[PDB]
Amino acid sequence: ARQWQPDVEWAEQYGGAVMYPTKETAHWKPPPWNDVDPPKDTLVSNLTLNFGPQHPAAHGVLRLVMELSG
Amino acid sequence: MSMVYMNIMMAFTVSLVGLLMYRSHLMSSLLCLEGMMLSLFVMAALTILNSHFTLASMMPIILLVFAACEAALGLSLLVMVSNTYGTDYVQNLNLLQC
Amino acid sequence: LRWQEDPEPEDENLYEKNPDSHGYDKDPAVDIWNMRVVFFFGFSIVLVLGSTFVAYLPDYRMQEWARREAERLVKYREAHGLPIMESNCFDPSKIQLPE
Amino acid sequence: KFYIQEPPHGSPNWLKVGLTLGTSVFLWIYLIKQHNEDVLEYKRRNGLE
């Protein structure tokens, strides 16, 4: 016949995270093709501050709620 | 080997054991590296000052200069770890598998 | 299909196109010269001249000489009463046995 | 003109060719001179020529 060459079934043995699957490495998945992981969901924690009313620069009765980063 | 060398060498061992047992914070481990440099500085300064090794008296200073470079370098990495996960926890540094 | 793969080709019988084929190549010109080199260098040279060369090796392994030498020694020793062959290959005078 | 875009190696870079051939000649002359000087010193030190 014709010389045998690997098919998709054979090659996908070498596409996993490891060559010898186990229970520990069942949830391992191959890394991204370009080493770049998705950025994590925005968790920026701005600091909220009451600037007034009892504040020298608040003119007495201003409650300025400010989101501060630093 | 006076009784002072015992405590200084014990300080190094405590900071070494402290560095090898992480809790959560990368910053807590960075302090142990700066603690180890402090022990080495004191131990080297004591030996040099006691033996009247005059020219070696600059070695402890050169030891602090390169301790700052490492400390600054460790802080710079801590900024980038924090910017990626919002904390300095070491358990997040596990994308790479052995 | 699981992929885009060429269908397996069928075999080519060299007799179909060249009934005089010697089995060496599709090209009749190459096929004939492939056969001539194999036969001339294989049969006419190596096997025939090699056979004659081996037949006339100049006394391979010195076996014919040892026969003439044995005849010369046998004649010499029988003509002087010496034993045909002794049980000692080396004269004991040169041997110094322990203690 | 066969290529739609001029190849980076369409024509020889005559600067490299001169340096390349020039470098080879220099090394061969240097090596041959080195070999002759080594042989003369060898014979001089061993007192045979």
Next chain:
Amino acid sequence: MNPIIFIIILLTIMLGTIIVMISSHWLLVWIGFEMNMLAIIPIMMKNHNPRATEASTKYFLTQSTASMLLMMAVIINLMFSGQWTVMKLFNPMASMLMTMALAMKLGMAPFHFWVPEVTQGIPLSSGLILLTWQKLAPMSVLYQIFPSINLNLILTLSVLSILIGGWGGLNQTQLRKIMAYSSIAHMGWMTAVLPYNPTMTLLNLIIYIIMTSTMFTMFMANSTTTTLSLSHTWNKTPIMTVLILATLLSMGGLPPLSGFMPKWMIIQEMTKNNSIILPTFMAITALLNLYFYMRLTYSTTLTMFPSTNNMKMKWQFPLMKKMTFLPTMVVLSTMMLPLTPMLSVLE
């Protein structure tokens, strides 16, 4: 990164290593490592992605700890000899710390866990520096302090490295992790012959660098970082697969290729010192290395894995990668056994 800044940081990495090799004072040796770590990390952070940040951080934590132990050894050696010369250490405890500090820097087992991870997390070019150039400075120090190194400690690390490196490389499909565990195994051969003949440590290091630099150069040419990505090379650059076959066979220690020379010379020196059980165990354990090199040849050169349609578009463009010294390195990494007696120049 600014090209001028990259060049300056690259030269700082070399300067740190060169300071360690020319230093005769322990303090300067320590300064060399600190300068080397200071410059290497920015090259690991170059692409600025989370995996590169983790790799740099794990690398910094390991190297920083080792430098602390090395300074402790120097100071202890100072207390018991009153001098800073870079020679045999004068206290057993100083030797153990320095030996372990140099083992952590080299990534020898059981201080090896970072090598597979740091290499995976950084680009191929940065990985090449990590596994070839970073080994020169620690090997320079071991070469000068070997008379005082505890024999059991150094041989134990060598044996564990040969075992862990071989086993770890079997369960890997990432090329950077395969090259990482291969590196650990080869460190074992360098440090196993160290007590007996430091010259053969240099020979194995030189040959390991040449072969390792050849593999990364060929992976860099095709931008392949996985077994399957490398499995498409036959359909783009057929010649490159033959060179990978010859180099991988050489790395496995098969004669008549170059990589058989370091094993052959290391076995000679150990058998002269009546060490027979260890060379035999080391050679047999090295068959683990040859197995996962053979597995790469199978999926790269000796078989033809499935391709993809878009590959036909890559046939219309040449290789624009520099591939510096690749034609010279591949020849030196395959045909040098007839020149084996040239190892005397290293003495």
Next chain:
Amino acid sequence: SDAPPLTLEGIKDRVLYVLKLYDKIDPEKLSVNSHFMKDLGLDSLDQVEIIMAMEDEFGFEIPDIDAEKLMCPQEIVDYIADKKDVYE
């Protein structure tokens, strides 16, 4: 990996477990097919509270268009199984 998968027996047990912690349901009156409104006597807002407990138990968001139809414990099991692909 190794954690046991979800089974209709498992889903049914957990659903009936949540409904027993609810204070307005008589534990010895809960049938896997009993209607929340007709049998247990609950009202609209009581049903909403139950669905939120299911979200906490099974850790996924149930929209209002879908939650408006889950009027008995069995319908919850079908919805959770249907959305979790648990055909077992």
Next chain:
Amino acid sequence: MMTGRQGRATFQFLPDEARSLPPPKLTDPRLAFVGFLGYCSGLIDNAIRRRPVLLAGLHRQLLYITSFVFVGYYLLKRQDYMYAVRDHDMFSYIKSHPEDFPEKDKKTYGEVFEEFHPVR
């Protein structure tokens, strides 16, 4: 083992005493093999960059051959020097310590008894 040799020529590629030894012949077989490795590098360079292997860039092929031979010649001089030094030290040490290298009393096989092991 020869790192600290008494020869006070440290970090020199070829100490001046190495000029007493014959240089390698330009027709040295070791030097021809090194030159051949240069030719293989030239051909491999053409193949990876997809050029006519035998014909492309004869100027570059010559520089490969010359570069290899040039470097090879000096590595052979240092290689032969290091082996010459090895024998020099070995013979000097044997001369300086005659008690450790005595001339063994000669015996002949007619006097030495060797056990005989039949093969039967």
Next chain:
Amino acid sequence: AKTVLRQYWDIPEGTECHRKTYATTSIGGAAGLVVSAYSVALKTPTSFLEGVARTGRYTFTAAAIGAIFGLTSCISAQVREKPDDPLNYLIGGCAGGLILGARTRSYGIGAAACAYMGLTAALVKMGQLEGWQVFAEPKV
């Protein structure tokens, strides 16, 4: 470990089997504690008692293997009146392999462990007699 080994090799073969069993059991037990440390360090137990349980499981397997080897290899050299015989260690090594099988609940591991631990014990004894060096001191 140097102390225990010197104690083991000072007791002549086939004598004082109570002492030799103490020595080997110490060596095996120490090996099981070294394995437990790395296992606990690299595979974090889910709880303190789950990790103490693991330490006791490995330490008892290694101690039992060490105890059975010294006991079985010492009575064998006593009954046969053949101290300097690697066959005594071959019997002891295989018995240790069988104990590993029982603890692992696997007949296959019992057979394989007996074969390879038996050979290793025999090779260890030969090296003691001949003078084989694993970590040989540099001489040339």
Next chain:
Amino acid sequence: LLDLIWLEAILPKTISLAQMKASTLVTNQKGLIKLYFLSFLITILISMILFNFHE
């Protein structure tokens, strides 16, 4: 029984099976800085208490 089973099952099939099993132990690692450095501490203590590498 001999060629296809037992001669395979002693030398080639068991030897291969062990290296695959030891490979998983070495590589199945959590990739945590905390656990690796904890093993470094164990190595240093073992190197002194057990093997006396410091003397």
Next chain:
Amino acid sequence: LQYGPLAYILGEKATKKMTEKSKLITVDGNICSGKSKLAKEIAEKLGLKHFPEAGIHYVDSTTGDGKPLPVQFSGNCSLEKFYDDPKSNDGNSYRLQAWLYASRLLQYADALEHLLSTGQGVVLERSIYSDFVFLEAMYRQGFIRKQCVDHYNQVKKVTICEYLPPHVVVYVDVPVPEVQSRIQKKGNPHEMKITSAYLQDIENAYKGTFLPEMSEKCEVLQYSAWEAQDAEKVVEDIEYLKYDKGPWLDQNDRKLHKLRMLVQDKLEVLNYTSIPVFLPEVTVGAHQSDQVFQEFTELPGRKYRAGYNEDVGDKWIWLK
């Protein structure tokens, strides 16, 4: 000399050659919406280079002698067969789309290289940023499988991130009935088989997913069919754009040097378009691929690197 670190260090820096006219403009729209005519005119008036829309044979037009190659050297992808039988089992639908993305990805790199190497702007037609409309249309009509869309996003996710978006996005809105009526007038037997549902999926993707995405990063100009005929009006709007948003404001010499190194190495641009993902649509067996590759190397002027082919009259090979 060839561009690299040495050239950059010696003065070849992108900002020194980019002016206020160094703009990258893309013309988008549905099928038969006047993009080609509009795009070609904006190039002449503004003095910009024009790139005809990337097709199945774009890569052939930049290499060798610039003439299209036989269709076996392109995977046998056919836009004609997609219209006739959009649900064939030989995977010609997605195989075409995956190939076209690689062509647009290549063209965009060619466009960026020209802009960064000489400072002249370029005008494109349906760049990589808008190629997903056809994919979304094929999937919603059952022309490709779900796994194919997963493959497209994986390839796109690792390629689109490396480039910068066009400065100006010109969109020529046309209601579907106008397009369908216009398609029939054009009288192309294959194109006339395009159902109206397919054209409506393209419309939804363009407005609803694409224009909102590009509105926050580019200068989006929308024109109807009636006001798109006079390219003079469109050019006037472009001339008076503020350019107050987009990543292009954050770029400097270092960032553009890294970008130019990527876009000049074409194999590095196409590195991730052939990731080892085994879909039947794109997977090719070893025997077939081997045979086709051998045939490719025996075409005139393609056995050796360009400039070393004797059969096409190249000379000085022995000194080159």
